[PDB]
């Protein structure tokens, strides 16, 4: 199956809007759709919602032997993924020219910026070191997959907490959250992606576009830039043909937006740590809105486990015992034996000769 086609009335209406500098959902040009984060119970797991998009991030680490060369660092996998349920079009092996540009954007940003400290993830050299592995999934496609994926990866990496080890002399030991407290990571900076869309041959631009606005646009400009004033990647793409003042304007815009987004992320992580430290209840369950028609909650229930013995006993007692015709095995010659109705002759011989 494919996705519904685009009519010729919506295109005209969207372009009349864009000309008039008014958007569908009311938000003006330099705005984001507001954000809403939610944390799991075990560390390094979050659900970010930008507008109506969803991404699931989950970090996980493991101890391996560090290849050959680079004997004093650790490796860092990544794996974006697009879930068949995100949108009709996504198909497990039929959208192979978006996955590549997305994985590349994500990896170049996160791994070339050098914000994670992969220096201090060794135990010995030439021997076991930690191998982290980020994982993202797209749940609901409504445009701007990469801003949400980047914020998700950031939060998931800034909420993880490793295991921890004791090393002295030439001897290892591995603890557990009851034997020793999990340990945080070291994060230099916060690289946060921003996207721009261009409309009718660069004459207008719109920040943070959604999926209809994504189908009425010429090309896209992405500018990934960590906090302070330091750019980390740019990738023009789509169908665009650019000037030189516009890249600078865009860089300013991305500066502002990454400032605001980092503000938000820091505040949310702080609130989450405060909640976890007070001693209250946390998790995916205690996030479900209760003021809403589509939610229902039920505490525990002993059902009545008073009768199962009797029923099982009568059932076992009330049925026919195994019968008693026992079969015999036949021996032809050591190596082959037969059981069943058998064959008339011992074996065939000169049947046709």
């Amino acid at each position: 199956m494919k996705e519904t086609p685009l009519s010729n009335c919506e295109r005209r209406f969207l372009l009349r809007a864009i000309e008039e500098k008014k958007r569908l959902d009311g938000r003006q040009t330099y705005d984001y759709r507001n954000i809403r984060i939610s944390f799991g119970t075990d560390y390094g797991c979050c659900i970010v919602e930008l507008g109506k998009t969803r991404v699931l991030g989950q970090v996980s680490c493991e101890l391996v032997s560090p290849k050959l060369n680079r004997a004093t660092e650790g490796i860092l996998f990544f794996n974006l993924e697009l879930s068949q349920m995100a949108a009709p079009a996504f198909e497990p092996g039929r959208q192979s020219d978006l996955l590549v540009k997305l994985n590349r954007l994500m990896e170049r940003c996160l791994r070339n910026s050098k914000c994670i400290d992969t220096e201090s993830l060794c135990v010995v050299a030439g021997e076991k070191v930690w191998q982290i592995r980020v994982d993202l999934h797209l749940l609901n496609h409504d445009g701007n997959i990469i801003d949400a994926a980047s914020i998700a990866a950031i939060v998931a990496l800034c909420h993880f907490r490793r295991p921890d080890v004791s090393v002295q002399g030439d001897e290892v030991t591995l603890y557990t959250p009851e034997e020793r407290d999990p340990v945080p990571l070291s994060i230099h900076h916060m690289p946060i992606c921003v996207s721009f869309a261009f409309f009718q041959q660069g004459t207008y631009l719109l920040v943070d576009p959604n999926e209809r606005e994504e189908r009425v646009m010429d090309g896209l400009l992405v500018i990934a830039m960590n906090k302070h004033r330091e750019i980390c990647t740019i990738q023009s793409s789509g169908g665009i043909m650019l000037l030189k003042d516009q890249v600078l304007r865009c860089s300013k815009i991305a500066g502002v937006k990454v400032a605001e987004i980092t503000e938000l992320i820091l505040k949310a992580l702080e609130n989450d740590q405060k909640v976890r430290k007070e001693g209250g209840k946390f998790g995916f369950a205690e996030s479900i809105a209760n003021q809403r028609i589509t939610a229902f909650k039920m505490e525990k229930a002993p059902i009545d486990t008073s009768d199962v013995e009797e029923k099982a006993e009568e059932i076992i007692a009330e049925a026919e015992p195994p019968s008693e015709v026992v079969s015999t095995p036949v021996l032809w010659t050591p190596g082959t034996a037969q059981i069943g109705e058998g064959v008339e002759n011992s074996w065939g011989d000169l049947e046709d000769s």
């Binding site: 068949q84 349920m85 009709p88 995916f284 589509t294 909650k297 505490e299 059902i303 076992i316």
Partner: protein, 208 residues
């Protein structure tokens, strides 16, 4: 024996036809369904529809185990969906594992059932998921946790009808005798009576 905290939310995502997140305690599973749509000519069947079930884990990539547990989920939904009313079309079920804390298959079956119900698919009868885990001595525990699952000598999971409480699907781990298989089946039959009440109360609240 006591089932733990239950919660459910419906119509989360705007793109699919019906969505339903079902979390029972700490573990959670999200599901969505696309209604009867077009199907590839090489896979279509006349006088019937075609059910497609794919399962995605949270860490790693699916292997032999996830397809072996995908057959069970597809062959369980195939026995309660009236496909003859919709031939030459396709019905697809997608399951995403968000968090794991024990008894994942039962929560997946309940997520699939609530997604099919929300999506508006003709159904013959509802189905449930109940998991039993008897300990090293014989003390039955219902809806266990991976802490108890690790210590337990046998774990059993059942899918039960909503009409006469028959047995639809059965996947068992560990070795046991038939007597406690009967007593855990009876415990499952006693447990489904509360899940179906949770179903009815949730849909009664939805249409308030």
């Amino acid at each position: 024996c006591s089932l733990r905290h239950f919660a459910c939310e419906q119509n989360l995502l705007s793109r699919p036809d019906g969505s339903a997140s079902f979390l029972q305690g700490d573990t959670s599973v999200l599901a969505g369904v696309y209604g009867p749509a077009e199907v590839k000519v090489s896979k279509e069947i006349f006088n019937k529809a075609t059910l497609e079930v794919i399962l995605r884990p949270k860490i790693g990539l699916p292997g032999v185990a996830e397809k072996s547990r995908e057959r069970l989920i597809r062959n369980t939904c195939e026995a309660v969906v009236l496909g003859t009313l919709h031939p030459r079309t396709s019905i697809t079920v997608v399951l995403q594992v968000v968090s794991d804390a024990g008894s994942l298959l039962a929560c997946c079956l309940n997520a699939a059932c609530m997604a099919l119900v929300d999506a508006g698919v003709p159904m013959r009868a509802l189905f449930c998921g109940v998991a039993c885990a008897l300990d090293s001595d014989g003390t039955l525990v219902l809806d266990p946790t991976s802490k108890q699952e690790k210590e337990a000598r046998a774990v059993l999971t059942f899918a039960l009808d909503s009409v006469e409480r028959k047995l639809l699907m059965s996947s068992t781990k560990g070795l046991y005798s038939d007597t406690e298989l009967q007593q855990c089946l009876a415990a499952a039959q006693a447990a489904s009576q509360h899940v179906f009440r949770f179903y009815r109360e949730s849909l009664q609240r939805r249409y308030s």
